[PDB]
Amino acid sequence: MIHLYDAKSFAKLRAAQYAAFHTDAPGSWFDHTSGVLESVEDGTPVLAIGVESGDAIVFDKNAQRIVAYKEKSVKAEDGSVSVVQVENGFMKQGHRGWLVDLTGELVGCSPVVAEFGGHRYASGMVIVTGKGNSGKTPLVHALGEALGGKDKYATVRFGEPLSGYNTDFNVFVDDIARAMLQHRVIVIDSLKNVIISRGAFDLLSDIGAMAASRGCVVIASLNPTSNDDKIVELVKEASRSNSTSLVISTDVDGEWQVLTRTGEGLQRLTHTLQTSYGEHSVLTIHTSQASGKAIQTVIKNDEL
Amino acid sequence: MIHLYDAKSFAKLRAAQYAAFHTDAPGSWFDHTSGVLESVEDGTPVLAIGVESGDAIVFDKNAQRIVAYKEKSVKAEDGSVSVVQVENGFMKQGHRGWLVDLTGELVGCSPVVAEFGGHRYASGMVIVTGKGNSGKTPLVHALGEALGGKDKYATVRFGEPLSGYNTDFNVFVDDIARAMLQHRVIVIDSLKNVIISRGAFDLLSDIGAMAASRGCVVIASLNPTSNDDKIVELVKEASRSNSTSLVISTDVDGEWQVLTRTGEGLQRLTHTLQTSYGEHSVLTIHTSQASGKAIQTVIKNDEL
Amino acid sequence: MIHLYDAKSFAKLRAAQYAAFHTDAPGSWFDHTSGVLESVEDGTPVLAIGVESGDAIVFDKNAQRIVAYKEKSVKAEDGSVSVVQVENGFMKQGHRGWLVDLTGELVGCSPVVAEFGGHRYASGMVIVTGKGNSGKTPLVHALGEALGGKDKYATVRFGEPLSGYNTDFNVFVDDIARAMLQHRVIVIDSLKNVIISRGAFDLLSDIGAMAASRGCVVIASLNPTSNDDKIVELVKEASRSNSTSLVISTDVDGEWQVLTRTGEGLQRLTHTLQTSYGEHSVLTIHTSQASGKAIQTVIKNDEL
Amino acid sequence: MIHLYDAKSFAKLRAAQYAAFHTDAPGSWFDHTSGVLESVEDGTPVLAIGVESGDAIVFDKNAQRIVAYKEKSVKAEDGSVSVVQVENGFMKQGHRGWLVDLTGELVGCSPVVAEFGGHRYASGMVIVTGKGNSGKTPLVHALGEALGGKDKYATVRFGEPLSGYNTDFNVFVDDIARAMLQHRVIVIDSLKNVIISRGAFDLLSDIGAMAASRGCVVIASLNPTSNDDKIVELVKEASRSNSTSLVISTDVDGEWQVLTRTGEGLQRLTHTLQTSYGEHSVLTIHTSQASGKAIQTVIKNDEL
Amino acid sequence: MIHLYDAKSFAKLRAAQYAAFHTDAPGSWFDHTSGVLESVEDGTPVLAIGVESGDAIVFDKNAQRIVAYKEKSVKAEDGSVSVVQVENGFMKQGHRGWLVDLTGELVGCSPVVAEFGGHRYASGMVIVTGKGNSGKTPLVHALGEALGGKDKYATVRFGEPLSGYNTDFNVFVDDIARAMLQHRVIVIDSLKNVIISRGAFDLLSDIGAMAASRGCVVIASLNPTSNDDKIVELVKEASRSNSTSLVISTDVDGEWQVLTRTGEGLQRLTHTLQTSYGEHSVLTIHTSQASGKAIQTVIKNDEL
Amino acid sequence: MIHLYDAKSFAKLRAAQYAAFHTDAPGSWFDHTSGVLESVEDGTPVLAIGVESGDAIVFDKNAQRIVAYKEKSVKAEDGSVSVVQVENGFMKQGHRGWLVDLTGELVGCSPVVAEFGGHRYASGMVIVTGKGNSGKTPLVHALGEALGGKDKYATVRFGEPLSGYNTDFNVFVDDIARAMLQHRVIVIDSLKNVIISRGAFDLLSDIGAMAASRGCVVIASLNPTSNDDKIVELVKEASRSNSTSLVISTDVDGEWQVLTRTGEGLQRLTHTLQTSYGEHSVLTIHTSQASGKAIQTVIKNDEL
Ligand SMILES: Nc1ncnc2c1ncn2[C@@H]1O[C@H](COP(=O)(O)CP(=O)(O)OP(=O)(O)O)[C@@H](O)[C@H]1O
Ligand SMILES: Nc1ncnc2c1ncn2[C@@H]1O[C@H](COP(=O)(O)CP(=O)(O)OP(=O)(O)O)[C@@H](O)[C@H]1O
Ligand SMILES: Nc1ncnc2c1ncn2[C@@H]1O[C@H](COP(=O)(O)CP(=O)(O)OP(=O)(O)O)[C@@H](O)[C@H]1O
Ligand SMILES: Nc1ncnc2c1ncn2[C@@H]1O[C@H](COP(=O)(O)CP(=O)(O)OP(=O)(O)O)[C@@H](O)[C@H]1O
Ligand SMILES: Nc1ncnc2c1ncn2[C@@H]1O[C@H](COP(=O)(O)CP(=O)(O)OP(=O)(O)O)[C@@H](O)[C@H]1O
Ligand SMILES: Nc1ncnc2c1ncn2[C@@H]1O[C@H](COP(=O)(O)CP(=O)(O)OP(=O)(O)O)[C@@H](O)[C@H]1O
Ligand SMILES: [Mg+2]
Ligand SMILES: [Mg+2]
Ligand SMILES: [Mg+2]
Ligand SMILES: [Mg+2]
Ligand SMILES: [Mg+2]
Ligand SMILES: [Mg+2]
C-alpha cells in the first residue's frame, strides 16, 4: 500500500530497517512470516507467481495450487482494496507476489537471513556471477549449506543438459513457489534459460521482493559469458537492480566478492570470501565494509 | 479543450501562468482542485489511468475504483463532447487523465507546490536522477518531507528487491492514482521497472500533466546507469520532456541541481542544493537563476 | 480522383497553382471552403481522421461526431465512386481526409493563408523546429497571432507535463479535427508525443493535405533534440515531406528561417525572421528567395 | 502459367520479345489489351490489387469494384486451374494481378509504349529518382505529356501536404487500378508514403508486371533523400528490381539518365535527356546505348 | 523416417549414394520416381507445399489440388505413423514435402539428373548467382535447355516487372509444385522476391530436398546485389546450405563456376563453364575437381 | 522436483554423480531407464516434446503418440503434484520432458554412455561443430558407430537438400522422440534448420536434459559458418550451455577436440581425436585432461 511520513515517522522507519539487517536475530524474520502463513485460513491464496504466458498461478500456505477461488476483497489500511479471484487454475483478479501481508508497516528491509564466518547475509535474491575460472555451481551449493546452518537448503534445478533437470518454465515457477513457502535457504541452479517471455520478465522483477518479504534467501547462478551486449546488459541490470545481494568472482581463482544491499536507502556492504575444493568438487568457504555507487559500477564492468 | 486567443487574451494568459508559479501562495492550487473534486457528484468518474495492457481503470473522488458506469456525455465550452462509460472494471469510453475539468481556462501552468529554503518548487513530475555516488532514494525522501512541510508526504514503492515492495504494474498505477487524489506531495521510489508495455508508456506521458493539473508534486527516482543507448536515451527523454522539473546529481558528493519549468513558454530556473547525512542514512537538505536550452542539454549529457 | 492532362490543360493548372499562392487574396481559399462546407446537407459526413488504433472517427460540418450513418455512395467525375458509412462511432466505409470535395480540379496548391511583415504564408502544415536556444513555444504562439491577423487563432495543446494538458491521442485528433473545421489559423503545441501508433502515423501523413485543402494553417512545434537516429530521422522526414512549410531556428538567437512549398512542382521560397521578447515571454516577430533542393537538405542537417 | 521450351521455341520467344520492344508499333500492345479487356463478359473480374491490409479488391473492365462474385474456375493450357471468388467486396479466391489473360505465350516483354525524341520507351514501371537539384515532380509530368503524345496522361496524386491530395492508401490503389484499366500513360506523384504495410509491399512488387502486361507505363517519382540505410536500400531495390525503367538525375542540373530493361534476359539500354523550364515550372524535355550490370550498380550508388 | 546402421550397412549406404551420382544413368532416378507416383491410388495426396501464410496446399499425382481428404494414417517401417487430412483446401494434418515415400532406404543422395559437355549434374536445387556483368537469366535458360537434353525444360516465372509475370507467392508455389510433379528440369526465374513470409522460409528450406527426392533439378536465379548484410547473408546461407549445387559468376565475363554436392557426407565437385551469346541474347554453354570447405567459403565471399 | 541437502547428503550426491560418469559400467544407465519405461502401465504418457507452435505432443513407452488421455495426477516426494492430460493430440496439462521419473534423487549426472579408444563418453547432447575443412557429417556417423559399439545407431535426418530428407519440424521432433525412446546412440544430421520458432527454442533447451536423463547420447551436427553475429552467438550458446559435450574441429585437418561435462558442479574433461577417410568417405576414428572455464571460452572463439 502507500505509506505517509513526516520527519519523525521516517526516522523511525529507517532505524527499524537498519535493525532488520544489523541487529535482529538471523532468520527471525523468516520464522515470523512462517507463523503468519500458518495462521492463514485454510485454502486462502497466499502467493501468486507468473507462468510463461504472463498469467499467474496461485498457491495456498501448503504450496498447493488453488484452482478455483471465488472473488473476495479486503480493504487495506490506506483504504485501498485487495481482490483475489481464481478460475480454472488462473488468477482472474489479484496481483503477483504475496497475497497476504507479511511485513506490514515494516517495508524496505533486507531481513538478516543468516550469519556465517563473521558476516551477516541478507534475504531476498543473491545472484552469483562473474567471468573467469571460479566455478559458480559449486559456489551456490556451498553458500546454500553455509547459510542453511542447522537447516537443510532447498535446490531448484532448471535448464542444464544434465539428468533429471526440468527445462519447463512453468514447472520451474511451481518449484520456486514451493521453495519460498517452505524453506529459508534456496539455491537455483541456472537462471540462464530465463535470461524473453513475459513470465521470465515477471520472475526477474518479482523474486527479490518476494524472498525479502518472506525472509528467505534465493541464491541464483547467472553466467554472463555471452558476448551479446543485448543479453549481457540484461545480466548486469539483473545483478544491479533485481538482486538484493551480489556474489561475483574476482581476478584470483577461488576468491569472491559479496555486495549486500542492507535496506531501503541504506549503504551497500562488501566483504571477500576465500574458498577451496575437497573431493568430488565439493567447495568450502573459509571462515576466520561500506562501498560507494561508483565502486558498484566498477564491479559491474567485470562482466564485459 | 481548444482555446482561442488574440494578442490581449494571450498576454493575460501568460501573466496568469507567470503568477501561478511566482506569486500564488505555495500549494494554493492543490487546495483549489481539492475543492473542485469534492464538489463532484458521488460515484462520478474523475480520474482514468492506464494499466499494463493499455486499458484504463477509473476512480471516483474518494479514490475508489468504478467498475460500472453507464454512458454519460458532457458538452464542453468549445462545443466538444466528453463521454465516459465504465464496464466490467474498464473504461469503455473516455480518455486517460482527469475526467473532470480542474483547470478551466488556466492551462499551461506549473502551480507552485511549495516553498523551501528560499526556493519555489513546482507541482507536476520531478525526476531525480544522475550518475555518481550521490544517493537518489535518500534524496527523494528528504525532498518529500521538505516540500510536504506541515503535511506528511505519500510514498509509492515499486520494483525493488526489498521487503514489502509491490512489483505488479497494475497495483502501481492504482497506488499512484489514489495518491494524486489525496496528497499534495508524492514520492515514487523506483520508476526503474517502468523504463516497455503500453501502460508504462502511457504512465510516462501522462503523469506530469495529471499532477500539474492537480497541483500535487510527484518526486520519482530514475537511475540512468545502464550503458544501453536504447534505455539511456529513454531516460533523457523522460528527464527532458516528461518531467516538469529535474533534480540531478553533480560532480560533488551531496550536491544536486534543480531545473524547473515555470510554465508554458516560460523560462526554466535552476538552483543548487547541498545535503548531508544524519543517522540511518536520513538525508537533510541544507537551507541558508534562468537557464538557456543549451545549458539544459549540457546537463542531460551527464547521463552518459 | 485522377486527372487527365495535355500540354495546354497542364500549363493552365500550373498557372492556377502559382496564383493560389502568389496572387490570390490572403485567406480567400479558407473563405471559399467555409462556403462549401456550410452548403453541405445537414448530417453529411465531411471529415474523417484516424484515432490511435488506426480506425477513423467522422465529423459533420459543425465539428460534431457522427456515430451512425448508413451506407451512401457518390459517383465522381472520373467515374469513381465514394462510399461513406459510419457504425457505432466508427467509419465502416470511406477514407481518411475530407469526405466532401473542397478542391475540384484545383489540386496541388498551397493556398495563401495570410500575409504578414511583407511575406505571404502558405496554408497546410508548418513545422517549427530546430536545435539551439531559440524557444519554439513562444514562436508558434507569435506566428499564430501574426497569421491570425484580425482573427483569433486556435490552440491545441498536447503531451506536455503542464496543467490542463490533454495527453490522450484520441482527444487530440478530435481537437485537431474541430480546429480545422472552424478556424483558419491553428497552433499545435507539442507534436513530440506523436513522434509509433497507426493513428500517429496517419496524422503525420494526413494533416498537411487536410489543412492545405481547407486553406487553414496548422503551426506545430517539434523538438528534434533526442540523439537517437531512429527518431531524429523521423523528425527530418516529417519536416522534409509532411510539412507544407518549415520554420527552423538558426545560429543566431531569436532568428528563424521560413522555407515554403508554394505549390505542386513549384519552387520553395525562403525568408528570415527576427524576433524579440516582451513581458512574460510574449514573443514579437519583427516586420520591416527561391531555394534549391541542396540548400534544403543543408538546413535539414541542422537537426543532428 | 508455366511454359515449356526447347532450343527452337526458346529462340522464337526471344525474337518475339525483342520485337515487342524494338520493332512493334509504339502503343500497339496497349491497344491490343484494350481490345481484350473490352471483349470480356460483363461483370467479369479483370483486375485484383491489394489494399493496405494485404487483402485484395477486384475490378471489372470499367474499373468498377466487384463486391460479390461466386466461385468460378477456368482451366489453363498447362492444365492448372484459375479460380476467382469475391465476397463482401474482397477476393476470397484468386490472385493479385490481371485476372484475365492479356499476354498468352508472349511473356517477359517490355512492350514499347511510345517513341519520343528518337527514343523508344517501355511500358511497365518507370521510377524517377536521384539526388541533387533537378526536380522530380516537373520531370514526371513532362514525361507523361511526352509519352502521352496524342493522348492525355493520367495523374494519380498521393501523400503530399498539398491541397486535394489523397493520403489514404486504399483510395490510392483504387486510383491506380482505374488508371491502368483506362490509360496508356500514367503518372504517380509521390511513391514516398508507400515507402511498410502488406498492401504497400504488394504494390511495389506487383505494379511493374501489371503495367507491362497491360502495355501502359506508370511513371513514379521516388525521393531517396533519407539517410536511413533501411529505407534507402529499399529505394535502391525498388529502382533496381521492381522498375522496368529508371530515370535518374545526374551531376548536371536538368540532365537525366534513362535506363531501360528491354525484355526478359535482354540488355538494358541507356540514353541522356536535357531539359529546361518555362513559365510556372512547366518542364520541357529537349529533342534533337547498351549498358552493363556493373554500370547499372554504379548509377545505383548515386542514391547514397 | 529414422534409419539404423552398423559399420556394414553404413558402408553399403555410402556406396549406394556414391553410385546414385557417379554411375547411375543420368535421369534414371526421375524415371524411377515417376513410376512410384503413377502407381499411387487416384486422388491420393502426394505432395504438400506451404503457401504464404505458412499453411500448406496439397496435390495429387496429376498436379491437381486436393481440397478435401478425410483423415488417413499409414504406419511406416520404423513404426512411425503418417496421417494426412485435407479440409477446405488446406492440410489439416500431414507435413510439408513428399507425402509418399519416393526414396525408401536410399536417402542422402544427389541423383544424377543429366550429363552435359562431359559433366554430371545433380538433381535438387541449383542456385545461379554472383556479382559482376555475367547475365543470370540467360544462363538459367541455357542450363535448362542443356540439362533438358531431349526433353523440354519447364519455366516458372516470378516477381519481375515484365509482361505476363505472376507476382503472387501462392500462384508461385502452385506452379513449382506442378512443375516438380511433371518435369525433370525446371527453371525458376527470380527467387528475388522470396528473399520474409513463413511460406518463403518454408520454400527455401524445402525445395532442395523435394527436388532431390524426385530426381528433378530446379535451376533458380538469385541476385546478391543488395548491400544489406541482412539479406546478403540470407543469400549466402541459401547458396551454402539450401542448394544442392551452386552456379556462380567469375571475374571473367561469360565464365561460371559449378559447385556440386554429390551426396550425404560426400565431397563437393567443381568445374568451370565458358559461355557466349548468339542472337537475341540466347546464351550457349561451350562444351569441349574435388573442393575443400575452405575453398567453398572463398567462393561465398564473392557475394559481398 | 526440489531436493534438500545438508553437508553430508550433498557430499553423497556429488560422489554418486562422479561415479555415474567415471566408474559406472558404460551404458548401464540406459539399460536401467529402459527397465523403468517398460515397467510403466500401458497407455501411460512417458514423454512430451514441443512441436513448432510451442504446443507439445505426447508419446507412450512404445513411441506411439497418445491423442487422448483424461486428466490424471500424481503426487511426488516433495509433495508436488504432476498432472498430465492429452486432448485432440495435444498436451492440455503437463510439462515438456520425461513424464515419468527416470532419475529419482540421482540428478545432475552425465551417465557414461560408452567407452571407446580408451575414453568414456557422456550421454546427453553432443554438438559437433567448428570451422575449417574437417567434415562434420562423416564425423557424426563415425561417432555414432563407435559409441554404438555392439548396437546399431539411429539416424535422424533433417533439413538438407538431399534425397529423402524430411524438412518439416514436427516430423523431426517425432523422429527424435522415437529415437530417444528406443536407442542409446542417436545421430542428428543438420541441426542447422532449427538454428526461430518456439518449438525450435524448446528443442535446444530440452534435448540435452532429456537424453542425459535417458542415458542415451544425441550426436548433432551444427555448422557455425554464417558471419551473422545474431546466429553465430546462438551457435556458441547452444555449444556452451545446451550441450552435455562438444566435439569441435581444430587447426589440423582430421583432428577433433572433445570437451565433456562430467556432471553437475564437476570439471570438464578434454581429449583429442585423430581420424582418416576410407572408401566412399567412410570416416574412421583412430584409437591408440581437466580443462578450465577460460580454456573453454578459448575454444568457443574458434567459431567466429
Ligand atoms: N576440483 C575442482 N578444482 C577446480 N575447479 C573445479 C573443481 N571441481 C569443479 N570445478 C569447477 O566448477 C565449475 C562449475 O561447474 P559448471 O557445471 O560449469 C557451473 P559454472 O561454470 O559455475 O556456471 P555455468 O554452468 O553457468 O558456466 C567449473 O568451472 C569446474 O571447472
Ligand atoms: N550514511 C551515508 N553516507 C553516504 N552515503 C549513504 C549513506 N547512507 C546511504 N547512502 C547512499 O544512499 C544511496 C542510495 O541508496 P539506494 O537504495 O541504492 C537508492 P539509489 O542508489 O540512490 O538509486 P537506485 O537504487 O535506483 O540505484 C546509496 O548510494 C548509499 O551509498
Ligand atoms: N524572456 C525570455 N527570454 C529568452 N528566452 C525565453 C524567454 N521566455 C521564454 N524563453 C524561452 O522559451 C523557450 C521555449 O519554452 P518551452 O516551454 O521549453 C517550449 P520549446 O523549448 O520551444 O520546445 P520544447 O519544450 O519541445 O523543447 C525556452 O527555451 C525559454 O528559454
Ligand atoms: N523554374 C524553376 N527553376 C528551377 N527549378 C524549379 C523551377 N520550378 C520548379 N523547380 C524545381 O522543381 C522541383 C520539384 O518540386 P517538388 O514539389 O519538390 C517535387 P521533387 O523535389 O522533384 O520530389 P520530392 O518532393 O520527393 O523531393 C524543386 O526542386 C523545384 O526547385
Ligand atoms: N548479347 C548480350 N551480350 C552481353 N550481355 C547480354 C547480352 N544479352 C543479354 N545480356 C545480359 O543478360 C543479363 C541478364 O539479364 P537480366 O534480365 O538483367 C537477368 P540478370 O541481370 O542476370 O539477373 P537479375 O535480373 O536478378 O539482376 C544482363 O546483364 C544483360 O546485359
Ligand atoms: N574422402 C574424403 N576426403 C576428405 N574429405 C572428405 C572426404 N569425403 C568427404 N569429405 C568431406 O566431408 C565433409 C562434410 O560433408 P557435408 O555433406 O558438407 C556435411 P559437413 O560439411 O560436415 O557439414 P555442413 O553440411 O553443415 O557444412 C565435406 O567437407 C567433404 O569435403
Ligand atoms: Mg552452472
Ligand atoms: Mg533507489
Ligand atoms: Mg514547446
Ligand atoms: Mg515531388
Ligand atoms: Mg533475372
Ligand atoms: Mg553436415
Count, residues in chain E:
304
CB F57 within 8 A of CB F97: no
* Ligand 6 pocket residue status of F223, Cβ below 6 Å: yes
C-alpha of residue B295 to centroid of ligand 3, in Å: 12
Q: What's the alpha-carbon Rg for chain C, to the nearest Å? A: 19
> What distance in Å separates the CA atoms of residue F207 and residue F217, rounded to the nearest whole number?
10
The answer to whether B91 touches B248, Cβ cutoff 8 Å, is: no
Structure-determination approach: X-ray
Closest CA to F128 of F183, F190, F179, F174: F190
Beta bridge partners of F109: F263
B237 pocket-lining for ligand 3 (C-beta < 6 Å): no
Instruction: Quickly list DSSP for C126-157.
Output: EEEE-SSSS-HHHHHHHHHHHHHTTSPEEEEE
Identify which of F26, F50, F86 has the alpha carbon closest to the alpha carbon of residue F201: F50
Helices (H), ranges, B75-115:
none
Set of chain E residues whose Cβ sits within 8 Å of the Cβ of D243:
161
Output phi, psi for B250, to 5 deg.
Answer: -110, -175
F289 touches chain E (CB under 8 A): no
Ranges assigned E (strand) in chain F: 3-5, 45-50, 56-60, 65-66, 69-75, 81-87, 90-93, 97-98, 112-116, 119-122, 124-129, 153-157, 185-189, 217-221, 245-249, 255-261, 268-277, 283-285, 290-291
**What is the Cα–Cα distance from F180 to F217, expressed in whole angstroms?**
8
Which residue, among B129, B110, B130, B107, has the nearest Cα to B269 in the 3D structure?
B110
CA B289-B292-B298 angle, 5° bins: 105
Helix (H), strand (E) counts: chain E: 7, 18
Kindly determine whether residue C5 and residue D223, on different chains, have CB atoms separated by under 8 Å: no
Helices (H) and strands (E) in chain A, counts: 7, 18
Residue F272's CB is within 10 A of a number of other CB atoms, namely: 11
Grid cell of A116 as nine digits: 556465517
Give how far the C-alpha of residue A126 lies from the chain's centroid of Cα atoms, to the nearest Å.
6
**Length of chain D (residues):** 304
Burial of E115 (0-12, 13-18, 19+ CB in 10 A): middle
Query: CA F57, F62, F64, F66: dihedral to nearest 10 degrees?
Result: -60
Round to whole Å and give the CA distance between C32 and C21.
15
- Measured in degrees and rounded to the nearest 5, phi and psi for residue A191 equal -90, -10
Q: Where are the domains of chain F?
A: 6-41+104-304, 42-103
For residues F252, F253, F255, F256, the Cα torsion angle rounded to the nearest 10 degrees is 100
Alpha carbon distance E69, D63 (integer Å):
39
Q: Which residues pair with C119 in a beta bridge?
A: C116
Sign of the CA dihedral D71, D75, D76, D80?
A: positive
C-alpha D160, offset from chain centre? 21
Contact C204, C176 (CB under 8 A): no
Q: Pick from A111, A112, A82, A101: which is nearest to A36 by CA?
A: A101
In angstroms, the Cα distances linking A193 to A204, A222, D62, F234 are 12, 10, 60, 13
Contacts of E11 in chain F (CB under 8 A): 279-280, 282
How many secondary structure helices (H) and strands (E) does chain C include? 7, 19
Distance of alpha carbon F243 from alpha carbon F240, whole angstroms = 6
- Residue with the smallest CA separation from ligand 1 atom 30 is F267
Structure-derived torsion over alpha carbons of residues F132, F137, F139, F144, reported in degrees to the nearest 10 = 160
DSSP designation for B302: T
Q: Is F73 on the interface with E (CB under 8 A)?
A: no
Question: What length does chain B have?
Answer: 304
Distance CA E170, CA F38 (A): 48
Q: Which of E283, E291, E23, E27 is nearest to E151 (CA)?
A: E27
* Interface membership of E157 toward D (CB under 8 Å): yes
The C-alpha atoms of residue B62 and residue A183 are separated, in whole angstroms, by 41
Dist. CA A67–CA E27, nearest whole Å: 64
Instruction: Tell me the C-alpha distance between F266 and A138, whole Å.
Output: 8
- Whether residues F80 and A178 touch (CB distance < 8 A) is answered with yes
Which of left, alpha, beta for E43 (phi over 0: left; psi -120 to 50: alpha)? left
Cα–chain center distance at A180: 9
Report the residue numbers after which chain D has a gap, meaning the C atom sits over 2.5 angstroms from the next written residue's N, or none. 195, 288
Contact residues for D85 (Cβ-Cβ < 8 A; gap 6+): D69, D70, D71, D72, D91, D92, D93, D94
d(C-alpha D248, C-alpha D259), whole Å: 8
Compute the Cα dihedral for B143, B146, B147, B153 and give only its sign: positive
Give the ligand with the smallest distance to the CA of E266.
6
CB B33 within 8 A of CB B111: no
Rounded Cα distance, B158 and B144, in Å? 16
What stretch of H or E contains D19? helix D7-22
CA distance F130 to F138: 14
Cβ count near F38 (within 10 Å)? 9
CB atoms within 10 A of CB A220: 28
Q: Give the E-state strand segments of A99-178 in sequence order.
A: 112-116, 119-122, 124-129, 153-157
CA–centroid distance, residue B277 to ligand 2 (Å) = 11
DSSP string covering F223-287:
------HHHHHHHHHHHHHS-SEEEEE-SSTTEEEEEEE-BTTPPEEEEEEEEEE-GGG-EEE--
Q: Which residues pair with B124 in a beta bridge?
A: B217
Q: Spelled out in words, what is the top-level CATH class assigned to the domain D42-103?
A: mainly beta
d(CA E243, CA E240) in angstroms, rounded, equals 6
Out of C242, C244, C266, C297, mutate this one to test ligand 4's pocket (max ligand atoms within 8 Å of CB): namely C266
Q: How far apart are CA F256 and CA D190, in angstroms?
A: 59
B52 contacts chain A (CB < 8 A): no
- Atom 21, ligand 2: residue with shortest CA distance: B135
The shortest CB-CB distance from B228 to any of A208, A233, A297 is to A233
Cross-strand pairs, E245? E126, E260
Q: Is B293 labelled a binding residue? A: yes
Hey, are the CB atoms on E178 and D236 less than 8 Å from each other?
Answer: no
For chain A, what percentages of helix, strand and coil (3-state, to nearest 5) are there?
Answer: 30, 30, 40
Q: What whole-number distance in Å separates Cα of residue F243 and Cα of residue F260?
A: 9
CB A85 within 8 A of CB A92: yes
Among D237, D213, D10, which residue's Cα sits nearest to residue D122? D213
Q: Does A156 touch chain B (CB under 8 A)?
A: no
From CA B259, how far away is CA E15, in angstroms rounded? 81
- Interatomic CA distance for residues B136 and B123, integer angstroms: 19
Q: List the end-to-end C-alpha distance of chain C, in Å, as a whole number.
A: 39
Q: How many whole angstroms separate alpha carbon D155 and alpha carbon D175?
A: 9
Chain B residues within 8 A of A3 when measuring between CB atoms: 154-155, 157
Residues of B in contact with C137 (CB under 8 A): 264-265
Three-state helix/strand/coil letters over A168-180? CHHHHHHHHHHHH
Burial string for A249-286 (b: 16+ CB within 10 Å, else e) reads: bbeeebebbbbbbbbbbbbbbbbebebeeeebbbbebe
Distances (CA, A) of E137 to D257, D259, D269, E153: 24, 18, 17, 14
| Window 192-221 of E, Cβ < 8 Å to D | 192-193
Q: Rg (Cα) of chain A, in Å, rounded?
A: 19
The DSSP 8-state label assigned to residue D41 in this structure reads P
Listed residue (B142, B150, B149) closest to B116, CA to CA:
B149
Q: How far, CA to CA in Å, does C84 sit from each of A269, C48, C73, C75, F75? A: 69, 10, 7, 12, 63
- D115 forms beta bridges with D120
Contact at CB, A293 and B164, closer than 8 angstroms: no
Between vectors from CA C39 to CA C38 and to CA C44, what angle results, nearest 5°? 80
**Can you tell me the distance from the alpha carbon of C166 to that of E220, in angstroms, rounded to the nearest whole number?**
57
Nearest to F33 by CA among F205, F181, F187, F185: F181
Are A257 and A121 a contacting pair, CB within 8 Å? no
What is D6-41+104-304's CATH topology? Rossmann fold (3.40.50)
Cα-based angle F34, F36, F42 (whole degrees, multiple of 5): 100
Write out chain A residues lying below 8 Å of F49, CB-based. Answer: none
Cα C34-C35-C37 angle, rounded to 5 deg: 65
Question: Are F109 and A163 inside 8 Å of each other by CB?
Answer: yes
In angstroms, rounded to a whole number, what is the distance separating the alpha carbons of residues B38 and D32?
79
Which residues contact residue C183 at a Cβ distance below 8 angstroms, ignoring those fewer than 6 apart? B4, C151, C152, C153, C154, C216
The whole-angstrom separation of Cα F187 and Cα F30 is 16
The partner residues of D93 in beta bridges, in order of sequence, read D85
Ligand 12 midpoint to CA E241 (Å): 9
Q: How far apart are CA A246 and CA A223, in angstroms?
A: 13
At residue C114, what is the residue type?
Answer: A
B170 is in an annotated binding site: no
Give me E49's grid cell. Answer: 507445399
Where does residue D43 rank: exposed (0-12), middle (13-18), buried (19+ CB within 10 A)? exposed
DSSP B152: P
**Strand (E) or helix (H) holding D156:** strand D153-157
Closest CA relative to residue B42, chosen from B65, B61, B68: B61
Burial of C7-22, coded b for 16+ CB within 10 Å and e otherwise, reads eeebbebbebbbebbe
* Nearest residue in chain E measured CA to CA from F59: E80
d(CA E207, CA E127): 11
- The DSSP element (H or E) to which C270 belongs, if any, is strand C268-277
Closest by Cα among C165, D240, D123, E112 to B263: C165
- Residue C173 sits at φ, ψ, to 5 deg, of -65, -30
Amino acid, res. C42: D
The residue among B228, E196, E228 whose CA lies nearest residue F228 is: E228
Pairwise CA distance, residues C242 & E118, whole Å: 62
E79 near F CB under 8 A? yes
DSSP for D76-120 reads: -TTS-EEEEEEETTEEEES-SEESS-SSTT--SB--EEEEETTEE
Tell me how far apart the alpha carbons of residues E235 and E241 are, in angstroms, rounded to a whole number: 10
- Give the closest residue to C168 by CA, choosing from C137, C144, C199: C199
* Shortest CA gap C35–chain D (Å): 17
Cα(D89)–Cα(F237) distance, rounded to whole angstroms? 50
- Could you tell me if the CB of F5 is within 6 A of ligand 6? no
Please state the φ and ψ torsions of residue D5, each to the nearest 5 degrees. Answer: -140, 160
d(CA A146, CA D191): 69
**Other beta carbons within 10 Å of E199:** 21
Which of E133, E158, E163, E231 to probe by mutation at the D interface, max D CB count within 10 Å?
Answer: E163
Give me the phi and psi of C147, to 5 degrees please: -75, -25
Q: What is the DSSP letter of D143?
A: H
CA distances from E18 to A87, D171, E8, E23, E266 (A): 62, 60, 15, 8, 8
Between helices F28-38 and F198-214, what is the axis angle to 10°? 100
At F26, list the grid cell.
558404460
CA–CA gap between residue A109 and residue A90 (Å, rounded)? 30
Find out whether C211 and C180 touch, Cβ atoms under 8 Å: yes
Judge if the beta carbon of residue E157 lies within 6 A of ligand 5.
no
Q: Give A264's Cβ-side CA count (13 Å radius).
A: 32
Three-state secondary structure call for residue C178: helix
Resolution in A: 2.4
Contact between residue D29 and residue D112 where contact means Cβ atoms under 8 Å apart: yes
